[PDB]
Write a protein that binds this ligand. Structure first.
Ligand SMILES: *[C@@H]1O[C@H](CO)[C@@H](O[C@@H]2O[C@H](CO)[C@@H](O[C@@H]3O[C@H](CO[C@H]4O[C@H](CO[C@H]5O[C@H](CO)[C@@H](O)[C@H](O)[C@@H]5O)[C@@H](O)[C@H](O[C@H]5O[C@H](CO)[C@@H](O)[C@H](O)[C@@H]5O)[C@@H]4O)[C@@H](O)[C@H](O[C@H]4O[C@H](CO)[C@@H](O)[C@H](O)[C@@H]4O)[C@@H]3O)[C@H](O)[C@H]2NC(C)=O)[C@H](O)[C@H]1NC(C)=O
Ligand SMILES: *[C@@H]1O[C@H](CO)[C@@H](O[C@@H]2O[C@H](CO)[C@@H](O[C@@H]3O[C@H](CO[C@H]4O[C@H](CO[C@H]5O[C@H](CO)[C@@H](O)[C@H](O)[C@@H]5O)[C@@H](O)[C@H](O[C@H]5O[C@H](CO)[C@@H](O)[C@H](O)[C@@H]5O)[C@@H]4O)[C@@H](O)[C@H](O)[C@@H]3O)[C@H](O)[C@H]2NC(C)=O)[C@H](O)[C@H]1NC(C)=O
Ligand SMILES: *[C@@H]1O[C@H](CO)[C@@H](O[C@@H]2O[C@H](CO)[C@@H](O[C@@H]3O[C@H](CO)[C@@H](O)[C@H](O)[C@@H]3O)[C@H](O)[C@H]2NC(C)=O)[C@H](O)[C@H]1NC(C)=O
Ligand SMILES: *[C@@H]1O[C@H](CO)[C@@H](O[C@@H]2O[C@H](CO)[C@@H](O[C@@H]3O[C@H](CO)[C@@H](O)[C@H](O)[C@@H]3O)[C@H](O)[C@H]2NC(C)=O)[C@H](O)[C@H]1NC(C)=O
Lengths: 121, 145, 101, 451, 145, 145, 52, 52
């Protein structure tokens, strides 16, 4: 058994920056991967990133290269996501998830509560 | 299970089931690659210094000491492998003189060798000089001409 | 910029009926499906093409024959219809869904 | 069938894989003088003076570099040996006090990284304090633009994680090779054949009693001092489409790389206790220049085209493009690199600006409060070395990540350099040498009768 | 080198070189006094507690366990020493029925030992029955009158 | 005591007391359950980590390694158990050609095998081929028809 | 003990190793005696004396 | 105190006694000890009266 906690959704205006956090408890963070997933109704889900807390490899998706940023903090056991110059295209819901085991990363057994983001004007 | 399945039974019955001890006297269920258990999962912490590492090493080496010592005591008399053996010297005058009937008819080994315990060294010496006679006679046969 | 697709797109059937879903066409990958949307974050339903996932009802089981890859969904309910997704490696489908009644 | 043929033959050749620990072997000639612990510890055993091998006829066996376990055994063993080396001779540090620095002015000019910094320590008598010049290297101080660093004064970066341990001055650090000989009842099998994809059957197979020497030098995203490939260029990577997994590329031909800490330096002692001796740089002499490295443009460019053309074989019509570092902490993005006790972090942007289808120079920075390995604890503090330091090596391989996102036919494909798991330093050479056990109780029915 | 020099050769050829495994399954090149190595120089620091010390002792005792267990399993059948043995027991009905020609003409043990693994216990049981019959017959032969 | 009471005697006398070394080659007075010493009293502090604990385990395992290696080298030649053995092989041309009288009359073995040490491997090879010939002949006799 | 007939041997006292063996062992046991039960000393502060 | 520019001196355990209580030595199996009973030994050369 394991759970993932999030701070909830935060609504904002077009064309600006924002942050969102997530943490994990149990099944120690320093060994195994994480990932962010985008959920926009009326549009397909699109994988965002996968972060190795062990050494900080990041593999930002090409379509959002540059303006999306991320990091971690081992002692606090958290995961910060950053993005810059948001638009109405990013009207979606965001999740922090983990795979079953620490050798596969495409079949995600544990999902966060979910956190919406809406911008209209 | 060795004798643990047929310990207290009759004398003749015990001789018929002496064989399953060979697995039982060396393997151990828990120390090593047993008939039920293999190497542990978190062996990285077994190899690193731990109290139960010293315990397992002590137990395993003690078992090896035990088996090697008793086999060697049995081996020196030329009885290696042969579960039933036989020696070239009759039995001494004292202790002696007990009838065979009860011993094989109804006795079990638990009550037998307690009186023989203090004299066991004598049987060892007798088997030893028996082996000495046997090996010198082997040398004489080797002396063809 | 898409290589993955699934058929059929939208399906109509009453609660309790059975239906067949498939993902296409030939791109290799470790195939998987994610359950219909209940409203919160979804859950898994299957691994490795044919391995029903833990903590899931037994109404789910797929089949794979090379390019051919199909899934049967049996005994639907009002608490299980919704927007579900097909996973191949990293992409996703086109938007498959099932409506009850 | 007379007697229905039951019998047993002693021995028989047969084997199965089995998890089991391995054993040390290192050239035991010179390091009898390193009584304190170090990698190839003197105790170990002396090496075999006659390594042996044989080629086995018609043996068909499948290797597998990712499934095997001995790499994990080493990742545990070397870490434990590191801890046991920094468990004794180590002076725990009552450092991190209220302190102040300011611009160096060694010459009339200001130095780039050092700052001449006052430091009030404990004197030998616990009641009294005194001031001395002490440690400042800019990556290891919590900054502020005011007349002090931190919110005020300053502190060393360690003191909200764990107690940093002083490295033993007398313990050297040099990566000489080490060998492994499995004990009796075990043996090692070697895949001599070339063009091996890291899995599947390997035909040309030879049995070797003991693994060849390996220098387990730690590093990130630039394999160095590793044994050259057999021929041309190969890509030993467990499946390419699995972009989560890392891609290893190995070179047959070497490329010279040299780095230098050009400045003269000298260490000055400081006392922090009854018999506990601190160390840090005392003074700097002569011309001032940043640490850097030199590399030939032509050979590097040739190697990158060779790697590109060979990896293009795994795709029908796609093209490739390199890029600078992904991001995040200095440890993974920069080129981690070690020589002599001092440490180098080097920016790798200039080495990956190329594309597919005369003396390049690198910027580098020193670091001395190292959060090595896990980043969770066991933080160590190396002592600075006197004089100038120059070090060279043969670059041998690179670590590649395939990025991801949506792709289409005719689009461009992008790789990036990354380090990460230190296990992928030692998986490069030790892909060979499966461990295996032999079970010498083969049987088969054959006619016989005792008597 | 044991089988490591002649592992994959013919069925008959394996029997001709079974002997050099005695050195190759007890000594080890590096663990202890071997055919190439002796005691180490800086043994004062090896006897004192060290990370690799427990590794060396574990390797030695594991090799000892490995040799002794299988040597006992061979000994209890009366086959001790005899590199090729023979038993007074027939083979069971199932598994059976494979022709001898290919098994010795060109086959090698590598492809033969897999399928007998799950049935291997049965051979131990039948050999145990053979030893039981043999020891009772030996006891009766001892009974001259 | 074994040859610790009979080392320097005659060759004939030496052969007459080859037996008691079996106790003296495995037991040890102090390491384990000897002929004079049992387990110590304060074993709670023996089992807990101590320098002399590592010494105990080192000594025990070294003795076991030694005895197993020698007994294995002796066994492979078919000489297991037999304190006096015999081989079906001649002696090589060199080094040979010494008169036999002094070797049995008054010679002591301390000065004997000094010059045989460098050639000792050759005897192992000769005994090895002897065992190979013997086992193939055993297989041929086993082949009745 | 036993006396051995006609045994000839050249004892050599300075070469033998076992003296060094015990010279290491006694020191190690000394350390293992004064490793536990030992109170690390924060002594050596300002002190002042005079004639007793 | 004299110790505080060399190393931290360690307190000796009050409970631990110190006396020169004797110790014997003896070797494991496969090893033995030889003794030179003869007198006037110069520390080298053959010793005749030898006991095990
Ligand atoms: C990849 O592979 C390559 C190829 O093999 C390999 O290249 C070599 O890399 C090393 C650096 O890692 C190069 O540099 C060497 O550095 C030596 C400098 O260290 C000296 O000081 C050490 C500590 O002692 C100091 O401090 C004490 C106390 O303050 C003081 O008393 C001393 O005087 C000294 O100042 C010391 O450990 C070190 O070496 C000694 O000890 C080791 C371990 O016991 C022993 O093995 C050595 O033989 C030596 O006794 C040394 O004393 C440098 O000195 C050394 O040799 C040069 O200087 C000496 C003395 O002046 C000359 O005699 C010699 O001819 C050299 O001029 C050496 O240069 C080394 O040069 C590379 N090899 C080549 C061929 O260039 C890489 O390391 C590998 N790894 C990587 C990551 O690339
Ligand atoms: C490593 O990377 C791989 C990509 O590079 C990645 O992708 C694939 O993963 C699967 C795992 O499920 C691997 O397994 C299979 O490989 C075969 C190889 O093709 C040949 O063999 C098939 C036999 O397959 C039969 O059995 C399977 C069930 O096991 C059925 O689905 C299948 O329909 C068959 O009944 C043979 O049929 C192939 O023949 C051709 O013609 C027939 C008839 O028209 C077609 O039906 C068939 O599709 C094909 O066109 C052929 O002789 C593959 O065909 C299977 O579909 C299946 O993919 C793959 O080997 C692997 N890809 C590669 C290139 O190896 C791995 O998942 C990845 N692994 C990891 C751990 O990350
Ligand atoms: C104590 O430990 C921390 C943790 O490593 C040391 O680093 C500090 O880590 C925090 C993590 O969030 C940094 O936070 C900053 O947040 C702002 C928010 O706007 C962001 O803009 C910055 O880029 C940064 O992420 C913080 O800067 C960083 N440094 C300091 C001085 O707090 C910290 O150095 C350790 N020591 C002390 C005295 O805190
Ligand atoms: C600190 O450690 C030192 C070293 O053992 C302690 O002893 C001091 O050692 C020095 C060594 O040179 C002595 O030097 C003196 O030099 C003069 C030169 O003329 C000579 O005439 C003297 O005979 C002597 O060699 C020094 O006297 C000696 N004692 C002191 C108090 O310095 C020292 O005690 C330790 N403690 C302190 C507080 O220094």
């Amino acid at each position: 058994q394991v759970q993932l906690v999030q701070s909830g959704g935060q609504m904002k205006k077009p064309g600006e920056s924002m942050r969102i956090s997530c943490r994990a408890s149990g099944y120690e963070f320093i060994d195994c991967t994480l990932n962010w997933i985008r959920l926009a109704p009326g549009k397909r889900p699109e994988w965002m990133g996968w972060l190795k807390p062990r050494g900080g490899a990041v593999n930002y998706a090409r379509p959002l290269q540059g303006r999306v940023t991320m990091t971690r903090d081992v002692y606090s056991d958290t995961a910060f996501l950053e993005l810059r110059s948001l638009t109405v295209d990013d009207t979606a819901v965001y999740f922090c998830t983990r795979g079953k085991n620490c050798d596969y990363n495409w079949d995600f057994e544990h999902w966060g509560r979910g956190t919406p983001v809406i911008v209209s004007s | 299970l060795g004798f643990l399945g047929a310990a207290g039974s009759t004398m003749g019955a015990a001789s018929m089931t002496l064989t399953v001890q060979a697995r039982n006297l060396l393997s151990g269920i828990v120390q090593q690659q047993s008939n039920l258990l293999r190497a542990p999962e978190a062996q990285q912490h077994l190899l690193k210094l731990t109290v139960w590492g010293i315990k397992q090493l002590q137990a395993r080496v003690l078992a090896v000491e035990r088996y090697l010592r008793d086999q060697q005591l049995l081996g020196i008399w030329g009885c290696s492998g042969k579960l039933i053996c036989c020696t070239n010297v009759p039995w001494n005058s004292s202790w002696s003189n007990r009838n065979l009937s009860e011993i094989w008819d109804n006795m079990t080994w638990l009550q037998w060798d307690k009186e023989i315990s203090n004299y066991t060294q004598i049987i060892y010496g007798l088997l030893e000089e028996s082996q000495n006679q046997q090996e010198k006679n082997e040398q004489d046969l080797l002396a063809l001409d | 910029e898409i290589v993955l697709t699934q058929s059929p797109g939208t399906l109509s059937l009453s609660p309790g009926e059975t239906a067949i879903i498939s993902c296409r066409t030939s791109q290799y990958g470790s195939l998987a499906w994610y359950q219909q949307r209940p409203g919160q974050a979804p859950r898994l339903v299957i691994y490795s093409g044919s391995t029903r996932a833990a903590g899931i009802p037994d109404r789910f089981s797929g089949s794979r024959w090379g390019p051919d890859y199909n899934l049967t969904i049996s005994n639907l309910e009002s608490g299980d219809f919704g927007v579900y997704y097909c996973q191949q490696y990293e992409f996703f489908g086109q938007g498959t869904k099932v409506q009850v009644d | 069938a007379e007697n229905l043929w039951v019998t047993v033959y002693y021995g028989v050749p047969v084997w199965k894989e089995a998890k089991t620990t391995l054993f040390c072997a290192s050239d035991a000639k010179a390091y009898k003088k390193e009584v304190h612990n170090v990698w190839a510890t003197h105790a170990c055993v002396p090496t075999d003076p006659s390594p042996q091998e044989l080629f086995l006829k018609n043996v068909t066996e499948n290797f597998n570099m990712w499934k095997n376990d001995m790499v994990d055994q080493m990742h545990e063993d070397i870490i434990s040996l590191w801890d046991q080396s920094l468990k004794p001779c180590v002076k725990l540090t009552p450092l991190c006090v209220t302190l102040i620095c300011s611009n160096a002015t060694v010459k009339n000019s200001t130095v780039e990284e050092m700052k001449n910094c006052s430091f009030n320590t404990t004197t030998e008598i616990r009641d009294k304090e005194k001031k001395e010049y002490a440690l400042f290297y800019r990556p290891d101080i919590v900054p502020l633009n005011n007349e002090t660093s931190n919110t005020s004064e300053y502190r060393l970066i360690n003191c909200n994680t764990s107690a940093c341990t002083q490295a033993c001055p007398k313990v050297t650090f040099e990566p000489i090779p080490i060998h492994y000989c499995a004990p009796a009842g075990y043996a090692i099998l070697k895949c001599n054949d070339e063009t091996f994809n890291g899995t599947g059957p390997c035909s040309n197979v030879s049995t070797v009693q003991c693994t060849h020497g390996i220098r387990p030098v730690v590093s990130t995203q630039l394999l160095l001092n590793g044994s050259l490939a057999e021929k041309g260029i190969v890509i030993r990577s467990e499946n390419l489409t699995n972009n989560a997994k890392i891609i290893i590329v190995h070179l047959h031909t070497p490329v010279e790389i040299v780095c230098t800490r050009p400045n003269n330096n000298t260490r000055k002692s400081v006392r922090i206790g009854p018999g506990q001796t601190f160390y840090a740089t005392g003074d700097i002499i002569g011309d001032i220049r940043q640490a850097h490295c030199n590399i030939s443009e032509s050979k590097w460019n040739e190697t990158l085209q060779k790697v590109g053309k060979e990896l293009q074989k795994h795709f029908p019509n796609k093209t490739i493009k390199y890029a600078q570092s992904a991001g995040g902490d200095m440890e993974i993005t920069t080129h981690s690199f070690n020589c002599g006790g001092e440490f180098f972090y080097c920016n790798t942007a200039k080495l990956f600006n190329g594309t597919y289808n005369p003396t390049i120079t690198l910027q580098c920075r020193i670091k001395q409060i190292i959060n090595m390995w896990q980043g969770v604890g066991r933080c160590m503090y190396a002592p600075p070395i006197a004089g100038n330091i120059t070090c060279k090596s043969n670059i041998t391989g690179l670590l590649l990540t395939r990025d991801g996102g949506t792709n289409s036919s005719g689009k461009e494909e992008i790789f990036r350099p990354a380090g990460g798991d230190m296990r992928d330093n030692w998986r490069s050479e030790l892909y060979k040498y499966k461990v295996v056990k032999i079970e010498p109780l083969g049987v088969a029915p054959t006619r016989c009768k005792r008597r």
